[PDB]
Amino acid sequence: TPVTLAKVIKVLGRTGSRGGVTQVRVEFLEDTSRTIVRNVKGPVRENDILVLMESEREARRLR
Amino acid sequence: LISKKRKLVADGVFYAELNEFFTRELAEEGYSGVEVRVTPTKTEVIIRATRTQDVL
Amino acid sequence: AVPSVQTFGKKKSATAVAHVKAGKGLIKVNGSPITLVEPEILRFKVYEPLLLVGLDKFSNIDIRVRVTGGGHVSQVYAIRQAIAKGLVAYHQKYVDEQSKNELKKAFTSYDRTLLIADSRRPEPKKFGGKGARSRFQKSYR
Amino acid sequence: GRVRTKTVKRASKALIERYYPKLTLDFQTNKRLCDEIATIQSKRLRNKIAGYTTHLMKRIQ
Amino acid sequence: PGVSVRDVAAQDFINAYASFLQRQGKLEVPGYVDIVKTSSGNEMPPQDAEGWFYKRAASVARHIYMRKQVGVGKLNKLYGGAKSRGVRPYKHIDASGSINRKVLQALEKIGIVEISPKGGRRISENGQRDLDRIAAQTLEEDE
Amino acid sequence: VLTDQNPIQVVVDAITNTGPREDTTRVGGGGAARRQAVDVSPLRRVNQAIALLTIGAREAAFRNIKTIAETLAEELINAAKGSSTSYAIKKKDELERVAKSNR
Amino acid sequence: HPRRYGKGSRQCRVCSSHTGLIRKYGLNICRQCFREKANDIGFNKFR
Amino acid sequence: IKIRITLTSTKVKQLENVSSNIVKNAEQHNLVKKGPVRLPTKVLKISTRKTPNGEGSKTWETYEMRIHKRYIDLEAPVQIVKRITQITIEPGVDVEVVVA
Amino acid sequence: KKSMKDRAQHAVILDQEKYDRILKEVPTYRYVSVSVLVDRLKIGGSLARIALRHLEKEGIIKPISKHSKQAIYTRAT
Amino acid sequence: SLVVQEQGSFQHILRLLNTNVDGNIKIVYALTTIKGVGRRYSNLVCKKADVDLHKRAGELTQEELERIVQIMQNPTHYKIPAWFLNRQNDITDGKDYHTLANNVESKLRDDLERLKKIRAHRGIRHFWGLRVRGQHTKTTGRRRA
RNA sequence: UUAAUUGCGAUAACGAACGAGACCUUAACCUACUAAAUAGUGGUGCUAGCAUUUGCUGGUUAUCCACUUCUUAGAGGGACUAUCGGUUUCAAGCCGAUGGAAGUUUGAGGCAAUAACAGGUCUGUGAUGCCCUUAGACGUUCUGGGCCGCACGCGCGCUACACUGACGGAGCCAGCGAGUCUAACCUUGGCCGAGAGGUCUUGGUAAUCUUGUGAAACUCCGUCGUGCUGGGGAUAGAGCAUUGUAAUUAUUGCUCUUCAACGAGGAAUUCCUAGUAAGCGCAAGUCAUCAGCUUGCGUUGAUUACGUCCCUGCCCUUUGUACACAC
């Protein structure tokens, strides 16, 4: 199961029409100082640790 | 003799009965209020009105 | 005279007055000792205040607690605060400070309700509903 | 909604423009001093007027 | 250092005392043995048909020394229980008066307790030395 | 008694194993509904992980002679070691392939 | 007049109505006159 | 002569004025006594519907009586049954004089 | 489909033809309890309790920790 | 800690009181199968016959079942306080009787046939099949006819 | 920015008012004051026992002594968002940490602005205008039925659909309230009866007596077994009592027997962010008797949110209107 470790620092805001999805800024531990935008379901804030199945994607907003 | 609870609601409805009755025939005599005072051996009732000598 | 102090505890409907005095070191509630208050699981829960520093503090101290009211788990939740508060009162009445400050910080740094009474009281029920925050079925067309 | 209202605001700057060099950054003696100023009815409102008055007194420093 | 019932568990004490009356001492014979429900909310007689009485005596004797002044009417609500009143929700139903009266009268001549004034029954010395000595032996039966 | 290691470390390992990492969302679209898949916060990971074991053993012990005492016990070891037979792992891969299809 | 009653033949004290009575509290009156009387029963009205 | 004075009044500010006053009168001379006991407030619960008819929501109200009662106990010979019976009564205050 | 059930046949009265195998088939079992006896040895829950008590009388297994409607067991190791 | 041998005397089928009785289960609850005897009365007869309670119905001898069922015909002779019988103070006889498994429906048929000849309110609707106990059937019990 | 025209600030506006806020009550803390056999606590006396060796458990109002921490509210104090670091013309305002009773206006309620409904009520009023009747009166009242009736459709509700269970024995803990005088209420204790229930007395006009309402949900010992079966008691039959002048279309309670559908309910829909929902019981309203309802109280007591306007609705601003009894 190829997974990548993901580090979050900043948070954008809660997105989605239902409001159950949050726009969160997330970085990468391996090859740090690289910015990729990703979505999340559960409540998030600064200084959390997340795992992503895939690393090459970009979703701006969701409904 | 009777319970104090039944006593303090009996004089209440007693006061309600009197307050209603004064306004029935003394309405045109400037009724303001009626106060009841509980005392041993004597009961004190005072009516607040304007034309005192007319009802005297 | 006799060296004795008394404390008390709280719960939803349970109060736990505790009598603490210097003697042969006995523990009992309602005439029954600590190992019989019948939670049968929370037996360790009520052991908690008097175990995390050992039995050296209860060598020659009799404590007796009387409990009245509250549910079974509420009843069990009452003795632990009474004995812990009685433990503090004994520390505040007979023994020195260097033992006292270590005892209290071990109590507070682990669990709050050992010395902190719970202020989360039930909310009164409201009209038009079975519960405090419940409403009846509307069933319109 | 922890937002102040003009009821405590009208009394506050009125206290400052006339009774400034009486109070201090302190809180509870500000509550006690409020008794020594024009009478105020509710003690609950006294908890807020004392809390507000020191709030401006942090800003002025 | 002196052991009472309060210093021992409730279940093992009333079991040891029940075995004491099972083996030694005759409590009484109720007459309506294992044909009653021992209450009104229940519909099944006790499974321990040959017993349910000397352990009944042990429980009431322990509690009549636990409590101070209670009567058979109080005993009915002490050992009552919810009754499945058909479709209606469960409601508390008091225990049978005759059963509690019979065991109390069974144990009056035994001496376990004596009649008290102002209502209820108060424990006699003859009936509490044995009620307290049994606790002094029941805690050592494990070893 | 079985797998004599610490049970609390086994259930922790089971939580890590059975915790889903990504899940799909709901998108209006208009007329028809579509699902978009993004990642799941670790707080939601553990909170969903405990539930999956809970309602995976409820029906397993429901209407059966087997009690709930060992039904939870067998479910947590199966999730921890990995068996692809218990309800928790089956649902975990079901949502993984659901998110994979709508990735 | 031939009459039996004696089984709840109680009317309103102030309006003589055999409708819903509160009773068992010393008032034995109807709900509406209980409403439009004021300052006699439960006047405090803190709650 | 065990003279006991019992007070029953609704207005909480009023019987306290009476209770403080009788204590002051009983404080004169010596007239040993005990302080004012605080018995629980007997709150009365009357519950009525706001709407007279069935139209409208199921709106409910609870009108309450807050009666406060506080008695005192006095023990002294025959002078005090004459020097205490002086009634300091006010509207809304009821007194019950019981001896022995 | 909801077809006819198997009518499980957990033992309710012991007998020699099936009493003998418990001492020979239960061995080599790492984890034992009352529940595993019901669904594998096809015996009753109450029957399991007495049989395990009889089997533990021979000094092979011990209750360790037990309570109402539950028990834990382990063979001689 | 009792061990009992189960020889060939065990049978999977029973036949008592001209009715089918199932075995392989507890005899106390196996007697409830036969109609006309409930759970309460079942344990009274079981303990009055001085038989074991936890023995199964299949492993049962003729003498024990005969002793159990000979109570049913004339229980009053066997020192019962006589308040469990289903037929007490009957109109025809006035004595206390316990109708067996086959007289239960014969008795109520006689009870129903005398209600019908008398044409009482409780009998006309019973012939009609409607409610006779006063229970409401305007909105409840629709799906029974 | 705030739940809030709630505040900052801008500004042909200034000065204002109502509502909200403010205010009050309840639930919270006080080992700080007055305290209190109609609540208690400890000890001194009498007395009972267990090992007697040091203690423990008790009972006792005329055996007293000291106190109000636990029980009761009086005057009162107590958190106002108080500190840091972040964010903001760096103003209002928001978030994370330490004492604790409290950092979703501490929680929940009461009161609750102008105007309107042609919303309900003449079946509450000895308050009613008009029409009708006014004496074989639509007035009062007496007797017996009716509002309970089913070919049926719907709305709030309870038992459920069994193993986190059913049944029977042990531990078995709360709060709110009510209770008789010229009447008959709550009923304690003893005795009798399986049970309901019956008799003789006792205590109370009430923190004192009912009542520690010893309640249930709850846990400990056993039986049962995955079986429309021990789940379930609809359905009926017979017998035992209570209420009442009378209870039959069983008022209601108790006993035995008969033991049906119901096996987690399809469109759709209802309530809910903490002691909350839900599970469970208690007091009161209707009552001479009868809770499956409601009003209050108490026990156990979850997961899931800290967001949005997508559906269903609301407020402010702009635009459009052939609407205005107004989509």
CB contact under 8 A, J47 and E49: yes
Output b/e per residue, C43-77; b: 16+ Cβ within 10 A.
eeebebbbeeeeeeebeebbbbbbbeebeeebbbb
Q: Locate tokens 């309405």: which residue?
A: B27
CA dist C48 → A37, C108, G3 (Å): 48, 12, 74
Rounded Cα gap, residues F78 and F3, in angstroms: 12
Structure tokens that stand for H11 in this block: 């207005």
Report chain E's terminal Cα–Cα distance, integer Å: 18
- The alpha carbon of residue C50 and the mean position of all alpha carbons in its chain are separated, in whole angstroms, by 11
Tally of domains in chain A:
1
CA distance G44 to chain H (A): 7
Rg (CA), chain I: 14
Backbone angles phi, psi at J21, to 5 degrees: -125, 130
Report chain F's terminal Cα–Cα distance, integer Å: 43
Q: What is the 3-state secondary structure (H, E, C) of E71-104?
A: CHHHHHHHCCEEECCCCCCCEEECECHHHHHHHH
Alpha helix ranges (H) inside J74-120: 104-118
**Amino acid letter for position E116:** S
User: Across the strands, what pairs with I70?
Assistant: I67
Nucleotide nearest to D32 (CA to C1'): K77
Rounded Cα gap, residues C10 and C124, in angstroms: 19
Nucleotide nearest to B6 (CA to C1'): K205
Q: Which residues of F touch I38 (CB under 8 A)?
A: 65-66
Report chain J's terminal Cα–Cα distance, integer Å: 55
Domains of chain B: 4-56 (3.30.300.20)
Per-position DSSP letters for chain A, written without gaps between them: ---EEEEEEEEEEEESSSS-EEEEEEEESTT-S-EEEEEESS---SSEEEEES--S-------
Range of the domain at H17: 1-100
Nucleotide nearest to C30 (CA to C1'): K57
Rounded Cα gap, residues E65 and E20, in angstroms: 18
Q: Is residue C88 helix, strand or coil?
A: helix
Q: Locate tokens 């006061």: which residue?
A: B15
Rounded Cα gap, residues H51 and H61, in angstroms: 10
CB contact under 8 A, F67 and I30: no
Q: Locate tokens 């008394």: which residue?
A: C6
Backbone angles phi, psi at B34, to 5 degrees: -135, 130
Q: Is any atom of nucleic acid chain K found less than 7 Å from the CB of residue C131? A: yes
Angle, nearest 10°, between helix axes F68-81 and F42-58? 130
Q: Is residue C91 helix, strand or coil?
A: helix
Nearest Cα residue to A42 out of F46, B22, J19, I76: F46
**Amino acid letter for position H11:** K
Structure tokens that stand for E31 in this block: 């007459």
Which helix or strand (DSSP H or E) is residue A28 part of? strand A21-28
Range of the domain at A15: 1-63
Chains B and A touch, contact meaning at least 3 pairs of CB atoms under 8 angstroms apart: no
Nearest Cα residue to C58 out of C23, C102, C33: C23
CA distance I17 to chain F (A): 25
CA distance C102 to chain E (A): 33
Structure tokens that stand for E7 in this block: 């210093």
Structure tokens that stand for G20 in this block: 């819903």
Q: Is residue J5 helix, strand or coil?
A: coil
Rounded Cα gap, residues E84 and C93, in angstroms: 56
Do I35 and I13 touch, CB atoms closer than 8 A?
no
Tally of domains in chain H:
1
Range of the domain at C36: 1-141
**Cβ-Cβ contacts under 8 Å for F77 (sequence gap 6 or more):** F2, F3, F10, F14
Range of the domain at G8: 1-47
How many CA within 13 A on the CB side of residue H100?
1
Q: Is any atom of nucleic acid chain K found less than 7 Å from the CB of residue C71? A: yes
**Cβ-Cβ contacts under 8 Å for E133 (sequence gap 6 or more):** none
Rounded Cα gap, residues E18 and E23, in angstroms: 9
Header resolution in angstroms: 3.9
Fold of I14-76: Arc Repressor Mutant, subunit A (1.10.10)
Question: Own/partner pairs for D21-24, CB < 8 Å, 24+ apart?
Answer: D23/D53, D23/D54, D23/D57, D24/D57
CA distance F69 to chain I (A): 8
Helices (H) and strands (E) in chain E, counts: 5, 4
Rounded Cα gap, residues C139 and C141, in angstroms: 7
Per-position DSSP letters for B1-56, written without gaps between them: ---HHHHHHHHHHHHHHHHHHHHHHSGGGT--EEEEEEETTEEEEEEE-S-HHHH-
Tally of domains in chain C:
1
G15 is in an annotated binding site: yes
**β-strand I32-33 against I70-73: which pairing, if any?**
antiparallel
CA dist J137 → E142, J127, J145 (Å): 64, 16, 12
Rounded Cα gap, residues B25 and B14, in angstroms: 18
Nearest Cα residue to B31 out of B9, B54, B12: B54
Tally of domains in chain G:
1
What is the sign of the dihedral through the CA atoms of G19, G23, G28 and G31?
negative
Q: Is residue I59 helix, strand or coil?
A: coil
G24 is in an annotated binding site: no
Q: Locate tokens 């709650």: which residue?
A: G47
CA dist A52 → A1, C102, F14 (Å): 11, 46, 20
User: Across the strands, what pairs with A40?
Assistant: A22
Nearest Cα residue to H45 out of G15, J67, C124: C124
Nucleotides of strand K within 7 Å of the protein's CB atoms: 1-4, 6-8, 20-31, 34-36, 38, 41-42, 48-51, 54-60, 69-75, 77-83, 91-94, 99-102, 105, 107-111, 119-122, 124-126, 141-143, 148-160, 162-181, 188-198, 202, 205-207, 211-212, 214-227, 230, 232-240, 244-246, 248-252, 254-259, 261, 269-282, 284-288, 291-292, 294-301, 303-310
Rounded Cα gap, residues H46 and H64, in angstroms: 6
User: Across the strands, what pairs with A28?
Assistant: A6
- The alpha carbon of residue C26 and the mean position of all alpha carbons in its chain are separated, in whole angstroms, by 17
Q: What angle do CA E83, E85, E86 make, to 5 degrees?
A: 135
Quickly give C117 CA vs K29 C1' distance in Å. 9
How many CA within 13 A on the CB side of residue C4?
9
Per-position DSSP letters for J28-85, written without gaps between them: HHHTTTSTT--HHHHHHHHHHTT--SSSBSSS--HHHHHHHHHHHHS-GGG---S-S-
Which helix or strand (DSSP H or E) is residue H73 part of? strand H60-75
Quickly give J115 CA vs K88 C1' distance in Å. 91
Which chain B residue's Cα is nearest to G25? B6
**Cβ-Cβ contacts under 8 Å for G35 (sequence gap 6 or more):** H48, H50, H52
